[PDB]
């Protein structure tokens, strides 16, 4: 049997900018066992995103997640599983350990991952690494709270790529 339950029922999921890619192999693969659900190695990509960003985890889609964090190819075979985790990943003070890259020099290729923190230069003059005028850090943080509206609550997403 496969360690599927170790992917779905784990205590912690990774950031979207640095998503966790777990490979499943050499096992039976019993698939007999939500917010959304749509459909020889199997890869389970585990990460946390905002509710209204769930729609970007799909072929043909664009946006901050699809372009700068987790790019899913248009020629995609597999299932996307999402569920609300507002009871787990939210805190009254703001659960600010979930980060995503708001800006990037170029958009990502399929399954490309970049976890560098090089200062982003928006302007033409160098800032030498200092986040001053026209220079910004490339990984902001989601301030998840239990009282946010549905589209702003945290969702745990597992993408099963075949």
């Amino acid at each position, epitope marked *: *049997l496969c*360690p599927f*339950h*170790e*992917v779905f*029922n*784990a*205590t*912690t999921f990774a950031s979207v900018y640095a998503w966790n890619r*777990k490979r499943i192999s050499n096992c039976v693969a019993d698939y007999s066992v939500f917010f959304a659900f749509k459909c020889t190695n199997v890869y389970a990509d585990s990460f946390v995103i905002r509710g209204n960003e769930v729609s970007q985890i799909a072929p043909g889609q664009t946006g901050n997640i699809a372009d700068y964090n987790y790019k899913l190819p248009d020629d995609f075979t597999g299932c996307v599983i999402a569920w609300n985790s507002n*009871k*787990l990943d939210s*805190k*009254p003070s703001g659960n600010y350990n979930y980060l995503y890259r708001l800006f990037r020099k170029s958009k990502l290729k399929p399954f490309e991952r970049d976890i560098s923190t090089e200062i982003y230069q928006a302007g033409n003059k160098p800032c030498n690494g200092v986040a001053g005028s026209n220079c910004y850090s490339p990984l902001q943080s989601y301030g998840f709270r239990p009282t946010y509206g549905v589209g702003h609550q945290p969702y745990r997403v597992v993408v099963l790529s075949f």
Partner: antibody
Amino acid sequence: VQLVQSGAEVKKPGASVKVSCKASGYPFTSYGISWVRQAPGQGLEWMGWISTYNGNTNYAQKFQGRVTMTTDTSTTTGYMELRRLRSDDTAVYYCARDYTRGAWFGESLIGGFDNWGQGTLVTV
Amino acid sequence: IVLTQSPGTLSLSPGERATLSCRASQTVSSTSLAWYQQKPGQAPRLLIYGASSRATGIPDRFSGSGSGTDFTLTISRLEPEDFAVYYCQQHDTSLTFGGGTKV
């Protein structure tokens, strides 16, 4: 799911004790096995955890250097050995099937100890 | 890390509501907390996992909740069969149990 442990034993200080735990009713290599000790009049004290797939272990520091855990997949039975028994180690030793750590990836899971054995009484 | 439970001896009449508290010395994730119930002469059983999810087979009169360093267990009606010793558990770091309380 059930776990079957051994009967009571009497040991002398400095001796070692080996406690078995026969498991059935579930896929053996899909779940880990943990051990918890309960001395008379006391609460529960965690000894350690062992994977049934990788063989990886996680022992509580206080029991490090004294406790060794192993499993035998072909007989779906777990074993624990406690060495250099002290007079203060008299207790009932429980075997439990855990859902607190993955047996394959080794990362923490949401759960607890689901199936407990009878408890093996060791006197010393 | 240490877990502390109170009251140590919550002995209440049957049919009444009963509550137990568990406090942590440090913040723990709700994903790594559980409650146990031990009957006299018996091995303990899992009552609640994931802070608030009832273990399979457990009656709906048992309801857990909490966050941060303050977690509780509520029994809506205390039955004759509920007079047991309760423990709180965490595995946010290592794995530890509280001292336990008797009902």
